[PDB]
Homo-oligomer: 340 residues x 6
C-alpha cells in the first residue's frame, strides 16, 4: 500500500490503471485494430513500469459504446475470442495480468437477446481466469443483458481479485459481496460519463474503507459523440486513502503498489474498523459484559435484506411506492422505456 515508485517487490502487486480514451468505432475490423492498440499500450507501459503485475483498462475500451444496434450485434464478442487472444498475447509478452472489457459479449441466445457487458481477468500466461458480466447495467441508457454472479480469483502474487463494472459500484452491496467472498482487490472498470464525477471519485474511496479492500478504478476519458468521460482512474488503499489518482486527461495512467501482507495483517489484527469482522459479531463487548458469551450477534437486523432475499417482489413493490411504479417517467420520456 504505497505510492510513487515504478518498482514492485515480492510483497506488492504493481497495479496500473488506464484513463483510456474512449473509442468511437463501428466495425469489427475497427474493434480488432483498437484491441491491438491496447495490446501495444500494455507492452509499452511495462517497459516504463517494471513492477507492473496488473494492468486495468476501462469498460468499453475495446469497442467503445456501440450506440447503433446493428453494429452492437455485429461486433459482439465471443469469449475466448480474437480480442481476448490479442490481449492474452500482450499479457504474456509484458509478463503481466490484465483486465479488459468486451462490450458486448454475445448472449447465449445471440442475436436474439441483448449482449452482456463483460470483463476478463487474464493472467501472465494468457489464460482467462475470471469472466464477469455487469450485474447492474446503467439503465435506462444501458441496454446490456444483466449478469448474475460475482467472482473471486487468485491474482498476481496471490492477491484475491473481484471484478465489477461501472454502475455496479454505486451499490454498496456488490462491494460487500466481493469482500465477503474474500476479495482483497476490487477492480471497477468503467466508462463513467459526466455528470457524476465527484460522486464516483468519492464512492470508490468509501467502498475501499467500508469493505477494508484495495480498490482499482479504470475510467474512460474523452468525448465519443454522445458522452464525455471524466477519467479519475485511481488506486485506493484498504484504509480509504487514495494511493494515486488521474485527472480527466486522455490516456492518463496511475500506478501503485498494494501490499499482500498489509491487507492480511489488517484483516487479522484491526479492531475498531475491522468492518468485515464486526458486521457479523455485533456488540461483542456488551454481550460479554452482560454474561452472554463471546461472539457478539451475527443475525441480520435489517428487514430490507431479509425481505429482498425472501420476497424480492415485495421489496420491489415497496420501493415502487417510494419512487415510481414504471421504469420510465413521462416527465422525461425515453424511446423504448415505458412510462405511465
Amino acid at each position: 500500500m504505497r505510492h510513487g515508485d515504478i518498482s514492485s517487490s515480492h510483497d506488492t502487486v504493481g497495479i496500473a490503471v488506464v484513463n483510456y480514451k474512449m473509442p468511437r468505432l463501428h466495425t469489427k475490423a475497427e474493434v480488432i485494430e483498437n484491441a491491438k492498440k491496447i495490446a501495444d499500450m500494455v507492452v509499452g507501459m511495462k517497459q516504463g513500469l517494471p513492477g507492473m503485475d496488473l494492468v486495468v483498462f476501462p469498460e468499453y475500451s475495446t469497442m467503445g459504446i456501440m450506440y447503433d444496434q446493428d453494429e452492437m450485434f455485429a461486433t459482439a464478442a465471443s469469449i475466448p475470442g480474437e480480442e481476448t487472444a490479442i490481449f492474452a498475447e500482450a499479457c504474456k509478452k509484458a509478463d503481466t495480468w490484465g483486465v479488459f472489457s468486451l462490450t458486448g459479449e454475445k448472449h447465449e441466445d445471440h442475436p436474439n437477446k441483448a449482449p452482456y457487458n463483460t470483463l476478463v481477468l487474464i493472467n501472465n500466461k494468457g489464460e482467462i481466469v475470471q469472466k464477469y458480466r455487469k450485474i447492474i447495467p446503467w439503465c435506462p441508457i444501458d441496454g446490456w443483458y444483466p449478469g448474475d454472479t460475482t467472482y473471486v480469483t487468485e491474482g498476481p502474487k496471490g492477491l484475491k481479485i473481484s471484478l465489477i463494472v461501472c454502475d455496479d459500484g454505486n451499490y454498496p452491496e456488490i462491494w460487500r459481496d466481493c469482500a465477503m467472498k474474500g476479495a482483497e482487490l476490487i477492480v471497477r472498470c468503467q466508462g463513467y460519463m459526466y455528470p457524476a464525477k465527484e460522486q464516483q471519485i468519492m464512492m470508490a474511496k468509501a467502498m475501499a474503507w467500508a469493505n477494508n479492500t484495495y480498490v482499482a478504478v479504470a475510467n474512460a476519458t474523452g468525448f465519443d459523440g454522445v458522452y464525455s468521460y471524466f477519467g479519475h482512474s485511481a488506486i485506493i488503499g484498504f484504509d480509504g486513502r487514495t494511493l494515486g489518482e488521474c485527472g480527466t486527461e486522455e490516456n492518463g495512467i496511475q500506478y501503485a503498489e498494494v501490499s499482500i501482507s498489509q491487507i492480511r495483517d489488517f484483516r487479522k489484527n484491526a479492531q475498531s474498523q475491522n468492518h468485515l469482522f464486526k458486521l457479523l459479531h455485533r456488540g461483542y463487548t456488551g454481550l460479554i459484559n452482560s454474561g452472554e458469551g463471546d461472539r457478539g450477534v451475527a443475525e441480520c437486523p435489517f428487514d430490507f435484506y431479509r425481505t429482498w432475499v425472501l420476497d424480492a417482489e415485495k421489496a420491489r413493490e415497496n420501493v415502487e411506492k417510494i419512487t415510481r411504479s414504471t421504469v420510465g417517467t413521462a416527465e422525461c420520456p425515453i424511446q423504448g422505456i415505458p412510462n405511465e
Copy 2:
C-alpha cells in the same frame, strides 16, 4: 436542499447540527445540569435561526462517555425520564423537533446487563416519536448492549426521518435499510473520535448519494480525558453534495434547508442515479429489448446477503476465515476481550 440562510419555508425543513463539546461527567446531578445546558442551547439557537425545525445533538452529548462502570450504571437513563423531559421542554419552547442522546439507556434487565446507547426524536410538542438503540456498538471499546431495530418517523413538515448512531454509519446496510423503509433524512449522531476523521466525512456523503437521502451528522468535539472528537458535523444533500459542514471547533453549528418537494421529485423522476429504484429493477432496458417484459430483475444476486439472512452462523464462519476467529487479537490485547 439549499445552504446559507437562517430562514426556512413551507417546503424546507431547517436542520441545525451541533458540534457539541464532549462532557466529562460522573454523577446523575452533573448529567442533569448538562441536559439543562443543552436545553438552553436549543432555545438560544432558535433565536438566531428562526427557520430551525430540527436540532441534532451528538451521541454522548448528555452524559459524555461513562468510562467508569459504576458511574455508567448509576447514570443510565429511563426513557421517558428526567433528561428527556428537560429536552422536551426546550423543543416546546423553541418550537422545534430535536434529536438527543441517552448513553446509557437502562436495559430491561438493568443493572444486570449493559445499557443501550439510544437516540430520541422529540417533536415540537415535546412528544418522543422515535427511540433508536445503536445496532452496531463501536466494539471493542463500546460496551453497550446492541439494539436490533431501525425506524422511520414522520418528522417536521412531514419529512421522514431515521436515526442511526456513530459506528452504525460505517456499514452501508443500515443506511439502505432506513432508505428502503422510506427515510428521507437519515440522522447520524456520533461521538466519533480521532483517528478516522476523513473517512467519516466521506462515508456520510457517500451514503447520502448511494441512498438518495438527505443526511445530517452531529459529531462531538473536544478532548474528554481519553478521546479527542473531530467534529465535522454536516448536512448533506441527496445528490451527495455537502450543504454545510463544521470544522473541528467546539460548539460549532451548521444549519441548512432541506426541501421536501425536491427529494420527492427526485425519487419519482430521477433515472440514471435513482439507486433505490434501480437496485430492484436491474437491467430493465436489456430485458425489454430482449422480449422479456418491462420490470427488470428484482432477485438478489449477492450470495453474501442470501447466506447472512438464511444462515448467519455460516456467514460468520466465512468471515472469520478472512479475518480472525476470536473477537480479540493477542497482538493488541484488551482486558475483557478474549483472544487466541
Copy 3:
C-alpha cells in the same frame, strides 16, 4: 438544484455546458464546417442526456479567435444567418434550447468598424430569442466593438435567462444588473485563457451567491496557437455551491438540474441572505425599532455609482488617478494601444 442524474422533471431545467475545444480556423467554409460539428454534438449529447433542455457552448466556439484581421472581417456573421440556421436545426432536432457564439457579428457599419462579439439563445423551435453583444471586451487584446445592453428572456420551462460573455463576468455590476432585471440563470460563455483559472472558477461561484442566481459557465479548452483555455465549465446553484464542474479536458461536459420552484421559493422566503431584497431595504429592523416605518432604506449610499451615473467622465478621471491615464502602458507596450 441537484446534480448527478441525466433526467430532468417538470420542475427542473436540465442544463449542459461544454468545454468545447477551441478551433483554429481561417475561412468561412471552415467556420460552417465547425458549426455543423457543434450541431452534431448537440444532437448526440441529447441522446445521452434525455433531460437536457439547455445546452451552452463557449465564446469563440464557432469561429475560434480570428487573430488575422482580414479573416476576422471575412468571417464575421450575420444574425440570423447561416451559422444560426445550422444551430437552430440542432435545437429543433434535439428538442433543446441552446446558447451559441458568433465572433464576430458584423457591425451595423461593417466592414468599417469592428465586429461585435455576440451570443444567441435559440429555443427548441429554432427561434433566436436573445442576442447579447459583449459589453466588456477583454481589452487590450480583444478588439471587438462593445455592446451596450443586457437582456432577460423566458427560457425552457419558464426559467428566466440572461447571457454574458467572458470578461463581463469579472465585473459584479453585470451580474447584478441581470439579476435585478429578473434573471434566474446567468449564462457566462467564455474563451477564458490561462493565466486566471482559479480566479475565474471563484468569480462564478461568488456571483451566484451574491445575486442569488443560478450560473452556467461554458469555457473553451485546448491550445489554439496563441492561448491555452482552462475549461472548468460549471453549473452553480443560487446558494453559491457548485453543482458540477469540468476540469481542463477538451470537450468535457457538465450537466445539472436547476429547479424553478427552488429559486422562486428562495427569493420569496430567504431572509438573511436574500441579497436582492436586502440591498434595497437596508436596516429595516433598526428603522422599525427606531419608529421609522417598515421598509428599510432604499437610497444608494455609494458615491461611485452616483458619480458614474451622473458624470461618467468624472468617474473616469477619478479612476485614472488610481491607475493610469492612457489605455496602454509604456512598461508593456502593445501595437495599436497608445501609452505615455
Copy 4:
C-alpha cells in the same frame, strides 16, 4: 504581498487579523474588562510579531452581541470614549495601528433610536482616523441603525484603508465604492455566524480580485449562547490569492505582509485584469480600431444602477416583484418584522 514571516519592511505593512472568541457580556464593567483583554492581546501580539503595523479585531469583539435590548442601550459606546481610550493606549504601547469594534455606538438620538454598529481605525499615536458605521445591517436579526458613508484613510506606511462590517461584504457595490475612492486595503470586520462559512471565505477572495485590492478579514469564533462564529480570518492579495487564513479556532491569528509598491505597480501597469481602469474604458481596442479615439467608453451601461441612483423607490418596487413586498415572510415569522 507575501506570507510566512513575522517581519515587515519599509515596503510592507504587517497586518495581523484575530479570530477573537466572541464574548457573552451584559454590563458596562464587563465590556471595559474585555476591552482591556483586547489591549493586552495587542501588546502581546506585537512582542511575537515585530513587523506588525496593523491589527484587526472582529465586529462585536468588544461587547459581544447585546441580545438584551436594555443591555444594548446601557452598553452603547461613545466614540471617542473609554473603550477607544483603552484601545488607543495599546496602539501607542505596541506602536501599531488597530481596528476595533463598538457595538453599539450611541445614535445621535440615543436612547430613542437604535445604536450604530461601528469600527474605528486608530493610528500608532492613539488617534482615531476613521469611524465607519455598518451601511448594511444583517437584517432581520441585526437591529442596528444603518450608516451611510464609506471612507478611505491614509494608513501605516501610507497604505490607503477602508473599513466595512460583516454583511456589507456580501454586496460587491461596497467593495467597489471603497476601491474607487482609492482604497488599497479593505478591512472586513465581522461576527459572521454559521451557516454561511464557505460562502464568506469565497466572497472575500472574489472581492480582492474584482477590485484589485488587498483584503483583511477578522472574524469571530466560538459559541455565544445563540450563534457559533466560523473564524477563517484571512489576508488576501489583490490578485485574489489568499496570503494566510485561520481555521475556526478560538483566538487564531493570521499575519501577512502587504507591499505598497506592488499594489501601486499593478494598478499602473496591469492590463487584462486592471478591473478598476477597464470598467471606465470599455472596448478601448475596438474603438481605436474603429476610428473612434482612444479612451474606450465610460458611460454606465447597466440600467439597475441608473434606476437605483435616479429613482431608488422604483428600484425597490422592481426588486419586490422578484422577491417579496414585505420585509418579513409569514412562512418564517420573526417578532417585530412585519409580513403579509
Copy 5:
C-alpha cells in the same frame, strides 16, 4: 502505514500525536502540575488507543514559552529530573514510549548561558533513550542555546527514531542527516505559531517523501498571550501521503499505524524514488551503458555543501551577500538583535 484503526500489530507501531494546548505558566510548581496533566493524558489516551506504542507531545507542551527571562531560568529543567520522572511513570503505566519537551533544559553553565530547548524519547520502561537539543532555534525570537547533534535510537518494535524541533524542520538538511543515519521515523515536535500554517503542513509531507521516512508532527494549539499555534499535528507515510492530520483544535489527537516491514521493503526494493540510495549512486544506468562500471557516482556535486563543510565562514560570507550582513534589520528592529 495505514490509518483509521485504534489497534496495532506486531508489524506496526501505533503512533499518537497531540495538538496540546499551549500552557501559559510562570512557576516551577505550575510546570510540575502541567507535567502531571500530560501524564494523565498519556494514560487516558492509552485506554482509548490500545495499539498506542508511541505518544508525541509538542515543543513547549510542558513549560509553555517562558517569555520572562527570570522565569525561564527559574523553570529550566534538569534531565533526568522531576518532569522526566513524571513522564516516565506515565510511559510505564500506559506501556508506551513517549516524546516530551523540556523548554528550557539547563545549560552546562546555567544560569550564565541560555538554556537548551530539548526533547526526550522515553521508553515503555521509563528510561530516557534519546535527548535532542534544537540545532536551529527559531531566531530572532527564540533565545535558546543551539544544540549540535542528531541521533537515531531503536524505538518500539525496533522502529528507528530521530527527534527534531520545530524550526529545524524548515531545513531539509536535518531530515536528510537523520535518514542517512538510519532513521525510519522522524518526529518533529513544535510550537509552531501562525503565520506559516500551510507551509509547515507541506514541509513535513515533502520531507517524508524526500527522505523516504515516516514523519510524526506534534504541534501546539491555542493562544498563549503572544502567539496562536496552528495545530495540524500529523503522521505521514514514507511515500509522502498523509496518514492522519489534526486541524487547529485544542487537544486534538491523531493516531496511525506505521509498518516496520513496509519501510524496510521499500528501502530495499524501491527504484525510481529510492532517494537515499540514488543520491549516492547518480547516473548508474548511464555509467553502466558507457562502460564505466556499475555503481553510479557518489561524489558530492554541490559546491555549497563542500564550501560549508571546508570553510563555514566563507559560506556565511557568501550568504550575507545574498541576504544581509547583520542578524537584525533596521527596517524591523528587535531589542537585543544588532542591525546596521
Copy 6:
C-alpha cells in the same frame, strides 16, 4: 509575485510555463520539425502574453524520449546546433528569453558514451547563456550520462536564474546549491511521468519555501507509448504559495509575474523564515544573550554532509546498509541493471 494578468512591468519578469505534449519521434528530421513547432508556439504565445519575458518548455519537449538506442544516438544534439538556432530565432522574434531541452546532447566521447540530458537558457538576443546537464538522471530507466555542475545566470530584468531537470528536484540539495549561489528563480524542466503527481506538485512548493526562491516548473503531458506525463506546470512564489498551476491538459500554459524587488526585499528584511541567512547563523539570539557575540553559529552540524564531502565512498557504503548494495533488485529486475 502576482498572478492573473498578461502584462509585466519593469519590476516583474513575466514567466510562461508550457505543459508541452510529449512528442514520440524517431528521426532527426522529425526532431527539427518539432523544434519548429516549439518556435512557432513561442511566437504565438507572445502575441497573447505581451508581458512574457521568459518561456519555459519541458524536458524532452524537443526530441521526446528516444527509447530506441540507435535513434537516441542518431538524434543527439550539438549545442549550439540546429535545434538551438531554431529556438534562438524564436526568442529574438518574440523578444523573450527561453528554456529548451536537448535530450540527448552528444557526450564529448559521442557515440561511445551516453548523451547528456541538457537544458539551455537563451536570451532575447538569441545567445545561449546557460547550459545545464541533469546531475541526477532518473535511474534506473534514465540512461543519460550525469552532469556535474549547477549554474546561476543573470536573466531578464536581472533576475538570477538556475536550471534543473526533473528528478534533480526530488533532492533538496540541488535547490539549496542553486539558491546559495544566488539564484532568484529555479527553473525545473521535466518529463515527469505518472505515478508521482501529487508528490511532485508538493516538492516544488516546498523547495520554493525552503530556499526562499521563485520556482517555475514546466512538465510534459500526454501519453507517448510508454509513459503518461501529468502536467501541473506551475509558477510558485518564494513564500511557498503557488502563483498559477496547470492541470494535466495537453499544451496547457501558465503565466505569472515575479517581482525582482520583492525577492530582494525579502532576502534583506525577512527574519523568522529567512532560511538562507539563518542556516549559517544558527542560534544568534541565544549566543548574544549568552555573551558569545552576534553572528550565531555557521559550522555544519550534520555528519552526513561532512562525510559525503570528505569520504563519498563511506557515505555510499553507509546508505547501502540502509537500502541495498546493488543498483538493481532481484525482486524487480531490469535488463542491464545488475542485482544480487
